[PDB]
């Protein structure tokens, strides 16, 4: 299960007030491999999924 | 040298090198090498080129 809660309070101090901004950050979840596609493991290297 | 390109009927030219990356998503390996695109003829200070030993000049066109 991919957590829809990625810990990024590590980014900003979460101010008491936040003004409306044209900019807006986004968290995008990314499944690195296609559906049914093989994930090949090279020796001594871990596979990120 | 320029006198060599004339004696041997060669072309006075320079080698264009670029780095190229080739990603194979089958193995996710990105391989980068210095690729040799080809030769670019060089111009002498007198504005002349040496192609196959022949002195050549590119004239100006008005359009």
Automatic annotation (TrEMBL), chain A:
It is found in: Plastid, Chloroplast. In plastids the minimal PEP RNA polymerase catalytic core is composed of four subunits: alpha, beta, beta', and beta''. When a (nuclear-encoded) sigma factor is associated with the core the holoenzyme is formed, which can initiate transcription. Belongs to the RNA polymerase beta' chain family. RpoC2 subfamily. DNA-dependent RNA polymerase catalyzes the transcription of DNA into RNA using the four ribonucleoside triphosphates as substrates. This is DNA-directed RNA polymerase subunit beta''. It comes from Sinapis alba (White mustard). The gene is rpoC2. The chain holds residues 786 to 834 of 1373 of the full protein.
Automatic annotation (TrEMBL), chain B:
Signal peptide: none annotated. It is found in: Plastid, Chloroplast. In plastids the minimal PEP RNA polymerase catalytic core is composed of four subunits: alpha, beta, beta', and beta''. When a (nuclear-encoded) sigma factor is associated with the core the holoenzyme is formed, which can initiate transcription. Belongs to the RNA polymerase beta chain family. DNA-dependent RNA polymerase catalyzes the transcription of DNA into RNA using the four ribonucleoside triphosphates as substrates. This is DNA-directed RNA polymerase subunit beta. It comes from Sinapis alba (White mustard). The chain holds residues 65 to 127 of 1072 of the full protein.
């Amino acid at each position: 299960e991919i957590a829809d809660s990625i810990n990024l309070a590590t980014l900003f101090p979460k101010d008491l007030f936040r003004e409306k901004d044209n900019i807006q950050l986004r968290v995008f979840n990314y499944i690195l491999y296609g559906n049914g596609k093989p994930t090949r493991g090279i020796s001594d290297t871990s596979i990120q999924l | 040298k320029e006198r060599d390109a004339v004696y041997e009927s060669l072309t006075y030219s320079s080698e264009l090198y670029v780095s190229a990356g080739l990603i194979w998503k089958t193995n996710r390996n990105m391989q980068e090498q210095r690729i040799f695109i080809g030769n670019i003829p060089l111009m002498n200070s007198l504005g002349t080129f040496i192609v196959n030993g022949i002195y050549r000049v590119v004239i100006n066109q008005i359009l």
